[model samples]
Target: GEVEISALAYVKMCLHAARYPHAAVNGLFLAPCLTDCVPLFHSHLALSVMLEVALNQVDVWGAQAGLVVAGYYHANAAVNDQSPGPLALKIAGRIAEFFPDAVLIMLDNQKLVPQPRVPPVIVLENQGLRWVPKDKNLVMWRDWEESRQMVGALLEDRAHQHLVDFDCHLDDIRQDWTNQRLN
Candidate 1:
């Protein structure tokens, strides 16, 4: 399957994630119809806890407004793996149950990165969505010593690459109100 996401959609996803670097964020990939769904547009994103309601609204409105949920995207706090992990695969299943055709995507946000670029968008499919037991990477949690050693090494690499910053921004949060006031 071909995934043709527009620059605007990609930027929205990355900005949504960057807005809250400490938690997971998710949204839908929307298009007028699934077949020609290139240049995807993103829907409003909320935390997973409140996803069902927002997605239900999106579904209702999309159907009425002639839009489709082409796919789903999630932003992880860390871990840059392209897989959907556990929760997102479940989300994929839900989307599949409703739509005849479906796909799922995930994004890894290294908020501290120096590069002013959108993080890679991970288009997860059946194989990559599952957590395979006895898989080499799954062995990271096999023991405490192993866990510390592996994550420590990865963090070190991120640091070396200048991708582990903790800078904060509040302007975006207030932008809506600020704009409303015509300031």
Candidate 2:
């Protein structure tokens, strides 16, 4: 809801910019609105579901907000993969699906980077591996290449679908506008 307000503001700014493109302000200002709307929508949907869980009790809004906020945080973390490209691409794709004019802007600003290629390590709790005090066997690199490859493959697979969906939606919007103009 908070994000929606800001997003709506940007939409208004964009509408205004079209008429005053050279008046010291040009280009769409709805970038943030388009950027943040996905998460905001998800948060609202999560809150609504949480509220329904409480049987429409009025006093549960606070708890619902808290839970929804935490859920949003977790979802964001998962999508972002504690990294940036995954979520950024997803968000840009969603926005471009809904607002075709924003695609170039989104793409221009987008910077997708490959995930780092460092082996991850997990610390043992001193229960499983027993070693001599002076031995150099405290930490070891676990093979994560397979898992990383899987993640990469999954993302690569989804990217084409995302682009297709975006193009389809944009075409639908264009058709709608064309039909409206013909009427």
Candidate 3:
């Protein structure tokens, strides 16, 4: 008998499986469902899904780690539209720090491109946070080279140290929220 399930049903099933423990803990049960719809949604949406799961399951370290790993995977999957400018160099430099082995892969894959317009100083924008350039106007990496250097510093630390630092940062933020009566 063939099993027929709608995308929504598959998503529900994936959500259930993710919440409950299974024998193949490391295997991705939701990937097939997501791949089916990848054409319908932009690759960034896949990254968002992974990030959302990570943020929501912060209480569970394993879940958060899984999400970060998934994010790195999907980050590579997305197309690069930037030209070989300062911004592209900055991104390439950071990616090299985190995934040294994948650096060549990124360059070879031509994932680094230049922007037609002036590159936005912001490396990444999220919520109210924009990884703005050091100068704040030019939107060029020439002013904030250290932002790219920091990525190397982060990657130099041990994996456990990385996780601990992240957890501690989250704790600090949580405490601040508590003090403000916001969370």
Candidate 4:
């Protein structure tokens, strides 16, 4: 269930969030599923599933807000520290209405983790293009069950594995896609 986010995607998330220190920036998960895979003798199919992109950063409150926008990212640190409100669900569900495969992400500091969730009642509806929340609360926190299950935790675990004991300079991350420090 874990998906790979490309460096291109991560840089965008980082740059956008850095610019909006006071507001949450939203964008697509940029999934290129089931493509760009070639067997490397014994490498397994993991590599293919290991490099999805998350780009096209947007503002949930900006010019491109719509139901088909893949994913949404928010920036409410205080509220985020405790729990993201139900609006996250409404936004993601709205995207799914069109993209059918979008995921929500919450950017905290320099880290970009998928937004956590609350248990959705699963009876959510949208009549006449308007979402009708199953619960009385209109904007609800996303459900953890579906959110975590959507992408296996190990996906992130494995993806970030190389950095667990990593020790490096800030300049270390200045490199581009091929891990080339000076290109």
lDDT for model 2: 0.24
Q: Can you write out model 2's per-residue Cα lDDT over 1-183, one digit (the tens) per residue?
A: 112222222222222222122111111113223331111211112233432332232123324233221111111112112222333334334334433332211101111232322322212221212111221233332234653353344334432122111112233433221111101
In the range 38-116, model 4's lDDT, one tens digit per residue, is: 1111111111222122221222212223322344333334433323345555545555654543433332342234333
Cα-based RMSD of the predictions, in order? Answer: 12.1, 19.2, 19.5, 14.1
Best by TM-score: 1
3 or 4, which is superior by lDDT?
4
Which stretch of 10 consecutive residues in model 1 shows the poorest summed lDDT? 161-170
How does each model score on lDDT? 0.41, 0.24, 0.24, 0.31
**Whose lDDT is higher: candidate 2's or candidate 4's?**
4
Error of 4 at 141 (Å): 23
Q: Candidate 1 residues 67-180, lDDT tens each?
A: 766445445556454555455666667666455555444444555453223334344344443433233332222244543343344344332112111010112332221111
Q: If both were scored by TM-score, which would come out higher, candidate 2 or candidate 4?
A: 4
Q: Which candidate is the best by lDDT?
A: 1
Models sorted by TM-score, best on top = 1, 4, 3, 2
10 residues in a row with least lDDT, candidate 3? 21-30
List the candidate numbers ranked by lDDT, top first: 1, 4, 2, 3
Q: Which residue pairs in candidate 3 have backbone atoms (N, alpha carbon, C) closer than 3 angstroms, thus clashing?
A: 82-113, 82-114, 83-113, 83-114, 83-115, 121-139
lDDT of 3 by residue, 1-183 (tens): 111212222122122222222100111111211221111111222234543443344334324234221112111222332123343344344434332122111111121241111211222311122222222322233323453343233323311122211212333444221111110
Instruction: Return the TM-score for each candidate structure.
Output: 0.51, 0.21, 0.21, 0.32
Candidate 4 ranges with C-alpha deviation above 4 Å: 32-69, 79-82, 99-104, 110-183
Off by over 4 Å in 2: 1-45, 51-73, 77-143, 159-183
